[PDB]
Amino acid sequence: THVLRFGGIFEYVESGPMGAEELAFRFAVNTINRNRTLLPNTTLTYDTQKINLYDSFEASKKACDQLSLGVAAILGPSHSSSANAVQSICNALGVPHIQTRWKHQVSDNKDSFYVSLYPDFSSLSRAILDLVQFFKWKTVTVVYDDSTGLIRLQELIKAPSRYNLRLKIRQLPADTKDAKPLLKEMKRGKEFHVIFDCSHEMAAGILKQALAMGMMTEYYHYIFTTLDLFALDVEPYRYSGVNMTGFRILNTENTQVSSIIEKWSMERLQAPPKPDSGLLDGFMTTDAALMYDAVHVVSVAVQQFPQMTVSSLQCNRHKPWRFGTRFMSLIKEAHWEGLTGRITFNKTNGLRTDFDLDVISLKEEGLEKIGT
Amino acid sequence: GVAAILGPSHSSSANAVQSICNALGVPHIQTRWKHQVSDNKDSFYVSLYPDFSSLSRAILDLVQFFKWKTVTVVYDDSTGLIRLQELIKAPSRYNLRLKIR
Ligand SMILES: *[C@H]1O[C@H](CO)[C@@H](O[C@H]2O[C@H](CO)[C@@H](O[C@@H]3O[C@H](CO)[C@@H](O)[C@H](O)[C@@H]3O)[C@H](O)[C@H]2NC(C)=O)[C@H](O)[C@H]1NC(C)=O
Numbered sequence A: 001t002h003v004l005r006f007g008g009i010f011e012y013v014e015s016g017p018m019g020a021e022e023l024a025f026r027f028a029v030n031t032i033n034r035n036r037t038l039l040p041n042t043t044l045t046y047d048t049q050k051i052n053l054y055d056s057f058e059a060s061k062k063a064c065d066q067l068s069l070g071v072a073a074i075l076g077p078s079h080s081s082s083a084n085a086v087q088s089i090c091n092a093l094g095v096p097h098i099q100t101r102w103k104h105q106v107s108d109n110k111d112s113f114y115v116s117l118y119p120d121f122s123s124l125s126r127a128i129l130d131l132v133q134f135f136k137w138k139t140v141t142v143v144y145d146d147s148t149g150l151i152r153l154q155e156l157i158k159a160p161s162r163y164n165l166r167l168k169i170r171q172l173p174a175d176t177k178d179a180k181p182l183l184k185e186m187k188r189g190k191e192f193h194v195i196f197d198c199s200h201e202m203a204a205g206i207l208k209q210a211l212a213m214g215m216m217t218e219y220y221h222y223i224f225t226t227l228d229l230f231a232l233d234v235e236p237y238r239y240s241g242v243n244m245t246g247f248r249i250l251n252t253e254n255t256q257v258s259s260i261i262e263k264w265s266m267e268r269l270q271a272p273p274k275p276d277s278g279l280l281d282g283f284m285t286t287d288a289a290l291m292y293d294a295v296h297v298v299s300v301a302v303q304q305f306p307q308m309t310v311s312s313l314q315c316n317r318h319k320p321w322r323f324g325t326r327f328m329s330l331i332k333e334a335h336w337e338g339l340t341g342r343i344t345f346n347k348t349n350g351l352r353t354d355f356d357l358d359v360i361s362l363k364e365e366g367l368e369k370i371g372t
Numbered sequence B: 001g002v003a004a005i006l007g008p009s010h011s012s013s014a015n016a017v018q019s020i021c022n023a024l025g026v027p028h029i030q031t032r033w034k035h036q037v038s039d040n041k042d043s044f045y046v047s048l049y050p051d052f053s054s055l056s057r058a059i060l061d062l063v064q065f066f067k068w069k070t071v072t073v074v075y076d077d078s079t080g081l082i083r084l085q086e087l088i089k090a091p092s093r094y095n096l097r098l099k100i101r
């Protein structure tokens, strides 16, 4: 029972309601605790510090803190701003860093102690192109909300010079309701293949709009790049005869996957949901799944590195951790079945470029698989 | 201590200093353009460098004055997208076909 701690960082409600990532992480540590098949001779505790959103200095101090007690590695906050702080901390003091949310890849950041289980945007976007190419649409239209969606689709944006197409680009304005006039001009625009890069919450806040202006008829077809396509409040709209298509690395075929899903669903509406928002209560989200998997890959590596030690280091003792060399390499080289399927780490840019994707579509009944 | 600070050139590294000065009230000035995140509430930072937003408006004006009917945009790294988003939104308003490499 080798004791170990994992740094926990959560940009959260800063209030009573507890966030999903903390939940899945603790769910994860419990999962370790019950099944000893992984780590028969080892059990890992954890320290979970909590910070504010888009607030670097506070995160950095907390980073020094979870250094003070010592762990193997941190779990990155889910927003890039302080994420950069975290990363420039980790590789600065040698402790491997694991990230879940996509960050803006800085082209020349020579950091080396980081990976990201998130489906890297490039592969996703390439699949997007293959998909739209199959459906033989021409006047496609993107709508994002903030800046980084364009980046997520850059591979999409560069397509026209090789592929005969067109696409205007339209913006959801600052607040969600503001999208009604956008739908107005799109109605004027008559753009019948509009792909969306947007947070599924905003997807909900705009589907009410689209049905409200009656735009959802059988001609229109939308494809939603987001990965929590599962928990959409699908039921009323599927009888608008519309066509939707999307992806889900979130496997459901494994019965173990299911069983863990219902265990979650017991612990999940345990947290008070927002049914008024129009989200299907009782379904764990893609990010939380990712960060569940991440502890498991950490474990599936560490079990083979019992030489693990926890140097109680300080931010000002600039000499890095003693054992960040082989352990990080192990994570890079490890493979596992998480809750998304196959999992590995591309050794080229220290990221992930490999996974398995089921494309899913809105059938007459709801989300039903339409390929791999 | 300083009366205030001048910013470093990058975007990413600049973020941290911006925040730090906000954590103590220092006025922070910058020199290069970066992408602001629309979800930062901070106040003590200003940019001399002209924003690329208005630049895009001017470029669009120039395009239309020449009356171009086709164009190519080329950038260095994807950040140029953010740098040009306003122009990138040309087609919705006027008859402009633009492509990117
Ligand atoms: C880890 O995965 C990386 C991504 O697959 C891979 O890097 C790169 O190599 C592949 C080709 O195997 C490229 O993927 C395609 O490349 C062709 C052009 O050859 C494109 O037409 C196609 O659209 C697609 O992009 C990636 O572009 C390229 N990516 C990077 C990051 O450079 C690594 O080689 C691989 N390394 C291992 C084995 O760990």
Ligand SMILES: *[C@@H]1O[C@H](CO)[C@@H](O)[C@H](O)[C@H]1NC(C)=O
Pocket (backbone or CB within 6 Å): A218, A219, A220, A221, A242, A243
């Ligand atoms: C929806 O998908 C079906 C099956 O591919 C297709 O027959 C139908 O024409 C599509 N409707 C549109 C135009 O969105």
